[PDB]
Amino acid sequence: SISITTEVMPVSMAKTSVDCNMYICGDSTECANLLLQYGSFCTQLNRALS
Amino acid sequence: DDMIAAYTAALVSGTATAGWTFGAGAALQIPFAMQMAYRFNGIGVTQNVLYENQKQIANQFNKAISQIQESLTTTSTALGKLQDVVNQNAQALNTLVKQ
Amino acid sequence: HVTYVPSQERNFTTAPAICHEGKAYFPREGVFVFNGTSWFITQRNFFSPQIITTDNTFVSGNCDVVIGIINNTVYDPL
């Protein structure tokens, strides 16, 4: 007999990006000023996601 | 690096002198033309094709080796995924220093 | 894992092909070997000498282009 079998495999997932400034301090200038010295952590996160 | 170079030299010498038999066990000597004939026979081509066109096949082999040599002397990004490893390690350590 | 390991190597004198009345005879599978008396054909992984016949070999061309060809005879059963 001749049989045909199916096999399904994932290849990719969704590409995503975050913006630290809006997630942490949404439209607040004082919070952004206090966040200004955490920039290495956010550039590390953005490098990982990209 | 000298130890790894010695390992690769041993592998290339064993391939050029013994063939395929030094992985299954003890090395068996065989002249290189006969080893080439078996490799040709392994892909469905009879060995008279090798034995009658040996000059052309040898010349094409030498020409291909020279092209590989010429490609690596010009600045390019052929080894670009080996550079990424050292770049990533250096960047991680410098990020630890700056944080 | 149960595996097969060959052993007890032996040296023979070998040739790529044999010439016989202006024709080149190549083996089907195996190699031509010489053990000091006469020429046989054998499998590569085990030593079992066989008589060089027309069934073992095939013909392609004449014997002036192949490097290392020798003169010998091929036994026809008929």
Ligand SMILES: *[C@@H]1O[C@H](CO)[C@@H](O)[C@H](O)[C@H]1NC(C)=O
């Ligand atoms: C070569 O092989 C043949 C096979 O019959 C044998 O008769 C002969 O004695 C062998 N010669 C040597 C030197 O072993």
Ligand SMILES: *[C@@H]1O[C@H](CO)[C@@H](O)[C@H](O)[C@H]1NC(C)=O
């Ligand atoms: C035997 O071989 C030699 C060299 O390969 C060749 O010159 C000679 O013609 C051969 N014998 C015959 C009968 O063709």
